[PDB]
Amino acid sequence: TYADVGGLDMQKQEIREAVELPLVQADLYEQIGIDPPRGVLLYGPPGTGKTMLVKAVANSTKAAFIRVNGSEFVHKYLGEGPRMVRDVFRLARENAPSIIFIDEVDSIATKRFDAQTGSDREVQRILIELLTQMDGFDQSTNVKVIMATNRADTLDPALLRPGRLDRKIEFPSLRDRRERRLIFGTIASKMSLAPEADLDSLIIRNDSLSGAVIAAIMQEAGLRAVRKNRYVILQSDLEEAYATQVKTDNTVDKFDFYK
Amino acid sequence: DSTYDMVGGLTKQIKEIKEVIELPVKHPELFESLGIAQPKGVILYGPPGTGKTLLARAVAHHTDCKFIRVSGAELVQKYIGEGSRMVRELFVMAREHAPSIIFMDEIDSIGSTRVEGSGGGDSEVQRTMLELLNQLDGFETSKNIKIIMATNRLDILDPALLRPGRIDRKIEFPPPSVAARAEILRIHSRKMNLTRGINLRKVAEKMNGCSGADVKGVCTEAGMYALRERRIHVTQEDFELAVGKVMNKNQETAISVAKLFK
Amino acid sequence: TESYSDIGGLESQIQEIKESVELPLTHPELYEEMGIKPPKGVILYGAPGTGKTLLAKAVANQTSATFLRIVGSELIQKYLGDGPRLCRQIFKVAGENAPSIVFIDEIDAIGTKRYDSNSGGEREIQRTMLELLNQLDGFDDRGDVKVIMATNKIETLDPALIRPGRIDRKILFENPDLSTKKKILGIHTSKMNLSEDVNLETLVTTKDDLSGADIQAMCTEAGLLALRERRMQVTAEDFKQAKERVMKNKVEENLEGLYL
Amino acid sequence: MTDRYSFSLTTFSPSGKLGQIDYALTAVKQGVTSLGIKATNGVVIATEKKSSSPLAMSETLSKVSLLTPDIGAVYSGMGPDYRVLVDKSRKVAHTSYKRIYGEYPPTKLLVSEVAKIMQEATQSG
Amino acid sequence: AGYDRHITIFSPEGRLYQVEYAFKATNQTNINSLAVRGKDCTVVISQKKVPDKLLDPTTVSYIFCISRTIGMVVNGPIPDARNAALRAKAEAAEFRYKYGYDMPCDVLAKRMANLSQIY
Amino acid sequence: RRYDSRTTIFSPEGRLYQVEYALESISHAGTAIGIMASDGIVLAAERKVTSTLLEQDTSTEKLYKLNDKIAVAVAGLTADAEILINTARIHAQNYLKTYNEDIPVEILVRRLSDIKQGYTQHGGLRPFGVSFIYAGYDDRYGYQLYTSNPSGNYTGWKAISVGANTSAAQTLLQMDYKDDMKVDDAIELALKTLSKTTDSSALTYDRLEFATIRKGANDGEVYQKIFKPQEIKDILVKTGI
Amino acid sequence: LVYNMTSFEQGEITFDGIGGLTEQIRELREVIELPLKNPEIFQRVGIKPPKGVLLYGPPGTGKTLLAKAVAATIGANFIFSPASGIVDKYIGESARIIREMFAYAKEHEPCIIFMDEVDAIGGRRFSEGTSADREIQRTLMELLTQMDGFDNLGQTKIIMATNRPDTLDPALLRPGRLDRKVEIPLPNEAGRLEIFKIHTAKVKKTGEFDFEAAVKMSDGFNGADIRNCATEAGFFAIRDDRDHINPDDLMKAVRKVAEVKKLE
Amino acid sequence: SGYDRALSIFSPDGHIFQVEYALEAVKRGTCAVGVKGKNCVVLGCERRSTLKLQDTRITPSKVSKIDSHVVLSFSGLNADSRILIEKARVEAQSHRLTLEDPVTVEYLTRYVAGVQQRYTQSGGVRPFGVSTLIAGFDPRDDEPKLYQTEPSGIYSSWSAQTIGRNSKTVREFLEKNYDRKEPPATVEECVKLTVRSLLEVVQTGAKNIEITVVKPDSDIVALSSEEINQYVTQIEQEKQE
Numbered sequence A: 001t002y003a004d005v006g007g008l009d010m011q012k013q014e015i016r017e018a019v020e021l022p023l024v025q026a027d028l029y030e031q032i033g034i035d036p037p038r039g040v041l042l043y044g045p046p047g048t049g050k051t052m053l054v055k056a057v058a059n060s061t062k063a064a065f066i067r068v069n070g071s072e073f074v075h076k077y078l079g080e081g082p083r084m085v086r087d088v089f090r091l092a093r094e095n096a097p098s099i100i101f102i103d104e105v106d107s108i109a110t111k112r113f114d115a116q117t118g119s120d121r122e123v124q125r126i127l128i129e130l131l132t133q134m135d136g137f138d139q140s141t142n143v144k145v146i147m148a149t150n151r152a153d154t155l156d157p158a159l160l161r162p163g164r165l166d167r168k169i170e171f172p173s174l175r176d177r178r179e180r181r182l183i184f185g186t187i188a189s190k191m192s193l194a195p196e197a198d199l200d201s202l203i204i205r206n207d208s209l210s211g212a213v214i215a216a217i218m219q220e221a222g223l224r225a226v227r228k229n230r231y232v233i234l235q236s237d238l239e240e241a242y243a244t245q246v247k248t249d250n251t252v253d254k255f256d257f258y259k
Numbered sequence B: 001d002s003t004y005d006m007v008g009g010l011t012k013q014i015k016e017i018k019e020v021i022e023l024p025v026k027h028p029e030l031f032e033s034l035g036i037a038q039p040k041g042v043i044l045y046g047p048p049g050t051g052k053t054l055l056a057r058a059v060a061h062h063t064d065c066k067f068i069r070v071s072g073a074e075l076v077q078k079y080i081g082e083g084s085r086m087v088r089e090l091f092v093m094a095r096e097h098a099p100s101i102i103f104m105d106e107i108d109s110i111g112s113t114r115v116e117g118s119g120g121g122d123s124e125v126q127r128t129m130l131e132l133l134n135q136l137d138g139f140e141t142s143k144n145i146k147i148i149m150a151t152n153r154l155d156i157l158d159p160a161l162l163r164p165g166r167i168d169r170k171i172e173f174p175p176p177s178v179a180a181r182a183e184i185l186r187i188h189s190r191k192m193n194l195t196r197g198i199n200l201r202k203v204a205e206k207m208n209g210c211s212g213a214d215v216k217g218v219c220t221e222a223g224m225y226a227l228r229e230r231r232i233h234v235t236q237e238d239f240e241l242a243v244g245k246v247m248n249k250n251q252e253t254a255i256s257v258a259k260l261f262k
Numbered sequence C: 001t002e003s004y005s006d007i008g009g010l011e012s013q014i015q016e017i018k019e020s021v022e023l024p025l026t027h028p029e030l031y032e033e034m035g036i037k038p039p040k041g042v043i044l045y046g047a048p049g050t051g052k053t054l055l056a057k058a059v060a061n062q063t064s065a066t067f068l069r070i071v072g073s074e075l076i077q078k079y080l081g082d083g084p085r086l087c088r089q090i091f092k093v094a095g096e097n098a099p100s101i102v103f104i105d106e107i108d109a110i111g112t113k114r115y116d117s118n119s120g121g122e123r124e125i126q127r128t129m130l131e132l133l134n135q136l137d138g139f140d141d142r143g144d145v146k147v148i149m150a151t152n153k154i155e156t157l158d159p160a161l162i163r164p165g166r167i168d169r170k171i172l173f174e175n176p177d178l179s180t181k182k183k184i185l186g187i188h189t190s191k192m193n194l195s196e197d198v199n200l201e202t203l204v205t206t207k208d209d210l211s212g213a214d215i216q217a218m219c220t221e222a223g224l225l226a227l228r229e230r231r232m233q234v235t236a237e238d239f240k241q242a243k244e245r246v247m248k249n250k251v252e253e254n255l256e257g258l259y260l
Numbered sequence D: 001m002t003d004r005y006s007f008s009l010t011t012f013s014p015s016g017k018l019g020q021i022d023y024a025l026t027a028v029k030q031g032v033t034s035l036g037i038k039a040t041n042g043v044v045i046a047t048e049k050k051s052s053s054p055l056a057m058s059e060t061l062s063k064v065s066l067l068t069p070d071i072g073a074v075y076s077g078m079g080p081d082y083r084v085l086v087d088k089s090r091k092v093a094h095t096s097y098k099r100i101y102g103e104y105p106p107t108k109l110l111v112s113e114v115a116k117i118m119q120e121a122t123q124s125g
Numbered sequence E: 001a002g003y004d005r006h007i008t009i010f011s012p013e014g015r016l017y018q019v020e021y022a023f024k025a026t027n028q029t030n031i032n033s034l035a036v037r038g039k040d041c042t043v044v045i046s047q048k049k050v051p052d053k054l055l056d057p058t059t060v061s062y063i064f065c066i067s068r069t070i071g072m073v074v075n076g077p078i079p080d081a082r083n084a085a086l087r088a089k090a091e092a093a094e095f096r097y098k099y100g101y102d103m104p105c106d107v108l109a110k111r112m113a114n115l116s117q118i119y
Numbered sequence F: 001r002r003y004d005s006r007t008t009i010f011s012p013e014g015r016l017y018q019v020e021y022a023l024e025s026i027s028h029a030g031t032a033i034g035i036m037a038s039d040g041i042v043l044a045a046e047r048k049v050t051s052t053l054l055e056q057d058t059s060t061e062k063l064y065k066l067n068d069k070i071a072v073a074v075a076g077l078t079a080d081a082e083i084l085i086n087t088a089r090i091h092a093q094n095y096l097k098t099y100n101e102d103i104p105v106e107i108l109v110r111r112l113s114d115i116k117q118g119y120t121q122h123g124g125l126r127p128f129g130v131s132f133i134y135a136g137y138d139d140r141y142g143y144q145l146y147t148s149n150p151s152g153n154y155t156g157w158k159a160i161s162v163g164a165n166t167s168a169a170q171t172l173l174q175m176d177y178k179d180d181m182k183v184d185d186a187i188e189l190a191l192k193t194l195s196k197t198t199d200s201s202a203l204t205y206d207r208l209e210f211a212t213i214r215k216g217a218n219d220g221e222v223y224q225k226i227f228k229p230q231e232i233k234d235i236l237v238k239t240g241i
Numbered sequence G: 001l002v003y004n005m006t007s008f009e010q011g012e013i014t015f016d017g018i019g020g021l022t023e024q025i026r027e028l029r030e031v032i033e034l035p036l037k038n039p040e041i042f043q044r045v046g047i048k049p050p051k052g053v054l055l056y057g058p059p060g061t062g063k064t065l066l067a068k069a070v071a072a073t074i075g076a077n078f079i080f081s082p083a084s085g086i087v088d089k090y091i092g093e094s095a096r097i098i099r100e101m102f103a104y105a106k107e108h109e110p111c112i113i114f115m116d117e118v119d120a121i122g123g124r125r126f127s128e129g130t131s132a133d134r135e136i137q138r139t140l141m142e143l144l145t146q147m148d149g150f151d152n153l154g155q156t157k158i159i160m161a162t163n164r165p166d167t168l169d170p171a172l173l174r175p176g177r178l179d180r181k182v183e184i185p186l187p188n189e190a191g192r193l194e195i196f197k198i199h200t201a202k203v204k205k206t207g208e209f210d211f212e213a214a215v216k217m218s219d220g221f222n223g224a225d226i227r228n229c230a231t232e233a234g235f236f237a238i239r240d241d242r243d244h245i246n247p248d249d250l251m252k253a254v255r256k257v258a259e260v261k262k263l264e
Numbered sequence H: 001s002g003y004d005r006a007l008s009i010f011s012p013d014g015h016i017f018q019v020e021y022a023l024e025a026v027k028r029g030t031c032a033v034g035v036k037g038k039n040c041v042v043l044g045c046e047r048r049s050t051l052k053l054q055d056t057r058i059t060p061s062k063v064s065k066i067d068s069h070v071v072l073s074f075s076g077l078n079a080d081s082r083i084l085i086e087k088a089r090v091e092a093q094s095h096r097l098t099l100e101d102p103v104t105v106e107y108l109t110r111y112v113a114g115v116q117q118r119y120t121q122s123g124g125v126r127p128f129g130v131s132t133l134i135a136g137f138d139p140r141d142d143e144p145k146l147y148q149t150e151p152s153g154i155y156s157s158w159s160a161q162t163i164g165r166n167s168k169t170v171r172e173f174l175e176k177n178y179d180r181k182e183p184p185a186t187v188e189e190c191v192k193l194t195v196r197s198l199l200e201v202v203q204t205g206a207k208n209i210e211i212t213v214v215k216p217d218s219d220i221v222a223l224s225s226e227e228i229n230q231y232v233t234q235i236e237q238e239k240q241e
């Protein structure tokens, strides 16, 4: 949930008002008289903590909710992809007010080059199944979309405009110390650790990190000690762990490849 | 539905649409007296977020004819040789109601240029609507049916579609001028509030020709920078704030220092 | 429904279909006098906007025989084994209704190379292309039913059926020359006023790389373009603005100007 | 998602660009950082080194090198295409400018020579 | 797709592949050696595997004393190694006759490595 | 099978698709303009990039020089452009020391173009993608202005341009030009075009450079003036951007 | 049944009637048996139980006999998904199969996977045919999200067997799961008689013992070698209709059949 | 197929391809007509009126003489035409040097074809995308003659011939009018013969033409823009209706 998430002090706010506030408070939007937004987009590299935030929103929405990752769309028999896509948006407006989540679209949301194939030509019209729905003759005022991607600079601009994605949001990089101190305190505090607590010795390091690697180090450090016929606590000799979270050394193609 | 007061931004284009649509229906007698032809459907190309689909929902509000729609790729189908059946069972539903406009929002999924290594049923059902528009029985269908299609970039397609005889006009929806950009603010603002001592042309002239739909984004967003603070009313500096922002990121990835040339 | 006296241009092209279809019903004693029987088959190349379908519907106006209506995609079916029956149906009934004609159009939908695919549906057309062959020349003669097939591109398509036994002449069309643009223009314009400005032998001219179909758009696009000026009849400069428009995005010789 | 024109470097695409020089630069990124600043009285150059095996005497290698007493250089990219480049460079400082003008080159008439060592690579396939 | 059967082609991600195959083609002998310095000296060992029983073991050797005060221990298959040890036994005439004295090791590696760069 | 993999192949349609794929490269390049008029020739420029931490101030990019008489403007690739001018600067001097006088401008381009033809057929080699402008003065023909093309054919123009969006810029030049302009009619003309068909709204002094030829040498031959920034930031404000 | 055996959780092959290892098998004892035995600690720490493992190395090691065997000790359902036999030329339908099994595994209450030759997933992508290689990640990437989504179960374990480790470098998929990656051995010369003691049992052969077997087993250190030598050495005592083995047939067997096990 | 992407292989019909694809390039070029009277030769051109920015001080010129008794005209593309013109005039002045004697026209014509034969035979080379023709008089005689050349490397001797756009209209035309039963005598009918021949292409533009003729005794003479403008009218003067 929200409290289970660490340092999203900024990003956490924009969606819990772009999703929850309207259905709870919409008369005040039109008390001005404007149309609120419909779509957003969450672009940042992996492990930066995006796919889990919606799962927090899933716990607290009091609406419907749908999970479709981008690879689920395609099949071998053409024509059925889009009707599956049409089956979605009709299901949404039916069980309204509802919203939708996608965990990846870079297999779909692309630049629409000049195709000369069936594969590269059939993927495109899938994308067209979205555009003719998200803004065509038949639209509505209950659906909202939560896109997602590990990166967003290639998917076509025709998808990127207002009416479609009124509020897209960034994510931090992996070298920003403030939240790093906030995550270790978060994750570690959820369980019981040692008094010898050299965690203000690890944050200071220059290394770049995600929210995913942190789940690795603090778990596999919880592995080595629990493996020691012990009961709870994790010894301050987890120096194995941090250095065990050095995957660049485990990449010979990052060791003896270009030279 | 929406209406023609809302599609402001132009008149030259829209004043060319019912040059072909409204006249033959209401008044063919002069055109039968003059008795020359019958100009059939139309295409309108332009970049996205410009008002293509918008004009096409309005016109239905101001037509008096029946107005059939097909959204993106609801004709391409799984089994074989019934996509065509899904077509020829369309037009027969039109001729029942002799005045019948149709509409298909996008064709670049269907009507892309043909090849042999791939592209099957879709390059077939295109190869019979292309018959239905101007064939023997198409001459029968050619009486009163009118067509509108709204692509994004037309070089992709065949010429046979946009070949005249069936496509007699090819309209451009370019991104606007200052006064065009300036007005549609009001068309997306008049609901708002008694905006306080404000100009809106001094800000349009700031934002050079980007698109139209973007302007719907600044206005809705500007109120939102006023919505947070329980400031129901609207500011000036919130506008040139937002428009100066939301296009920055659009001008963020355009840079590159490859420079293998000069 | 249309007739002759509505084309003017195609003369080198039109004498054949006359020799295939319109004539032999009249004076077959010509062909036998030599000891000869006319073609069983015709085809028409593409180069669109040049009057292919127009020609076929003309002869239907005066043929004194049974005439048919097919586009290439009505043949195909869904149940995977009923398509090719349908072809034998239309040919036997034509014999029952002989002397008869057919017209299969845009058959690039059907006619393709033996692509040797892996789909499961694209096979059931190749068989459907094949009973035709086995029907049309095949094993046994069929009588006096004639084919007038059409297309828009053939330079890599229509593999094997294009041969004698099945088709005998290959008329081709292109965008006309200067000489034909003269008389063809008189066709459409022979109901309007043409107040005094005619000058037509400079209006149309070479380097107007246009079609034989766009002209009627130019003809009709002008009249209303004059109507909106509250002037029903027409002048020259009505047409000048039109030709300025419709020609605009046909071609661009930016890669030319090198062969100095 | 590129094809049929990065195969070589002597076929202009319709878009009008050469094949794989754009892709050589892709490694230049993937090498270590570097920098240099112009002051009003001097100039600086600097690089780190992520020496793979710590057992290496890191002093032996030198990212930086000499060209003259007055000129110095550094890269950010592939290694072994540097330590030959310099000998191919300072050999040119002598035979080109020095022995027909007496003294050492300025920087740009020493950099222009480096380029003519480079373009001779992108001449053929 | 190309990109692999030729040397002088970069991949679009930057890394070429053909040398990386040669970096991998060293250990077809399943041999592992070791070197270590001293206070005034240095030593090199080398594992041996002569499974068949008809090889005079004295001549099988991945060692080539190229000249005075130089040594070399190789990996990779033997024939390519001789094709390198020769060039070492050639330069040590030249650097002596051309510049006067014996080659240090560091130059001899710097020189030899430029040759394998040119390929 | 399409006919582009080598420049030694005619197409069945009778054309050499590789060469067109070079003449399109200059479209990526930066604008260049020249005007021919009474007193002397003028040129312009526009750098492709105008960022902060690189000095285009003293470092000319688009306007090299070939002799005190002749100066050029350059486009396209940069590595395949220097060697041309470093050939032209040789051929001229190798025309001087033998004939003891200056170069006629027509011979240079005739000799500089027919080598680009040499890199069009004989060998599987790249054609040099470059579109020079030539500006200079010879006595047998007075003032002169030529233009090149990486095929190898030239043309003696009056006032033209190349680079990004020249097709529109010509339309801004075809109809609003007068042969009797002295100098500054061409200047406010020239600088007005680049102001219209640019990429961004800066028009900063760094973004562009000018040059001139002038017969103002009173019975002496000729002068040049390649303007420093202080001579061109003062003129546009003196002209009304 | 449709797909695989599933072992009915009790078909009790001997994980110790084998000449394998004690360290590795005890390394696996941690990640599987300890929680399913003893949840009182992972609960006490709150760490979720582990996420799968890799077992590299080429065959002969027995890197599939232990797997279903220890699964038989705990009693889960053992199945297959050989990636060589999962790829399908069509655009989708390589990912559908992934989606069936994570679902169908959960149709059963416990279930564990044995993927093999998974390099078919983890390819270097040297061809770079974007019509294909854009899809290769598409089906692969679906695995990453189909595998650890909402599944908070302690029953659905994962295994991936991968000969040729590190051939994959499109993505090493390191962070998070794969809580072990066992340093697999080969059959040491000491383990030979540890292995020959296995298959030799259930025979009346006058012993058939020797120390000339590991020398024969030298470089033929693969379990199939010993399975087959005991096979064909069994076929030579009957070559003359004898009654019991002689150990010379073993010294004959491994010497004369590891030939194919060393040249091809 | 694949038989057409080189110069050193034969299709199974026996004929090479890259050569006669050149004949498709030359078809894309301008006209070039020539006629011989009884004692004088003429030559034409489909000059263009492109735009009002080429210097009227220097009109272009297809024609290019090599010596005072020989000329040359071509069509196709100009770059590959510039070379052999320079290898020609070089070769002629050598024949004056070595032999103290001018060139028989047949000897010249076999030198230009003697290069169009090697530039297709030995690969590593592209042909000359040009057809040409020769015109003039032999020394010490009035014998008129013109020869044609084409990139296959063969030389013929027509009496009238053309190359390029709508040549097919013309080569049939002169057959309907020109004939050896009545060979013309002097200029004003060879020109009155020719200026009408161009008209299939010229579409009534007289800023789109040039012309030359030939002398005995090693001379030539060019021609004006009004000196045709009357001939624009006598040819139209017959066209009263």
Ligand SMILES: Nc1ncnc2c1ncn2[C@@H]1O[C@H](COP(=O)(O)OP(=O)(O)OP(=O)(O)O)[C@@H](O)[C@H]1O
Pocket (backbone or CB within 6 Å): A131, A132, A135, A136, A158, A163, B006, B007, B008, B009, B047, B048, B049, B050, B051, B052, B053, B054, B105, B106, B150, B151, B152, B184, B211, B212, B213, B214, B216
């Ligand atoms: N000039 C305008 N007048 C009114 N609305 C406009 C105008 N320009 C943009 N819009 C807004 O932009 C949206 C329409 O986008 P547009 O129709 O240009 O894209 P589209 O044609 O629907 O894209 P596609 O049809 O390719 O999916 C609407 O929300 C509309 O309110």
Ligand SMILES: Nc1ncnc2c1ncn2[C@@H]1O[C@H](COP(=O)(O)OP(=O)(O)OP(=O)(O)O)[C@@H](O)[C@H]1O
Pocket (backbone or CB within 6 Å): B130, B131, B134, B135, B160, B163, B165, C006, C007, C008, C009, C010, C047, C048, C049, C050, C051, C052, C053, C054, C055, C150, C152, C184, C187, C212, C213, C216
């Ligand atoms: N000589 C002519 N007189 C009148 N109209 C002509 C003439 N030639 C062509 N046309 C026009 O061309 C159109 C027919 O084009 P065409 O015959 O190519 O159609 P088609 O057979 O379906 O082929 P396509 O699919 O390429 O259009 C007609 O609508 C007609 O107006």
Ligand SMILES: Nc1ncnc2c1ncn2[C@@H]1O[C@H](COP(=O)(O)OP(=O)(O)O)[C@@H](O)[C@H]1O
Pocket (backbone or CB within 6 Å): A004, A005, A006, A007, A045, A046, A047, A048, A049, A050, A051, A052, A103, A149, A150, A183, A187, A210, A211, A212, A215
């Ligand atoms: N702030 C955080 N606290 C704890 N775990 C985090 C945090 N951010 C990310 N993670 C971990 O990273 C994973 C999410 O990866 P993510 O970047 O969302 O991949 P994707 O977006 O492709 O699904 C989660 O499983 C979670 O364990």
Ligand SMILES: Nc1ncnc2c1ncn2[C@@H]1O[C@H](COP(=O)(O)OP(=O)(O)O)[C@@H](O)[C@H]1O
Pocket (backbone or CB within 6 Å): G018, G019, G020, G021, G058, G059, G060, G061, G062, G063, G064, G065, G195, G198, G222, G223, G224, G227
């Ligand atoms: N450690 C071992 N001890 C005894 N037999 C073994 C051992 N390892 C493998 N085997 C034999 O080899 C077979 C297993 O082959 P294996 O190497 O697991 O194939 P894969 O590696 O493809 O799973 C078993 O039937 C067994 O008889």
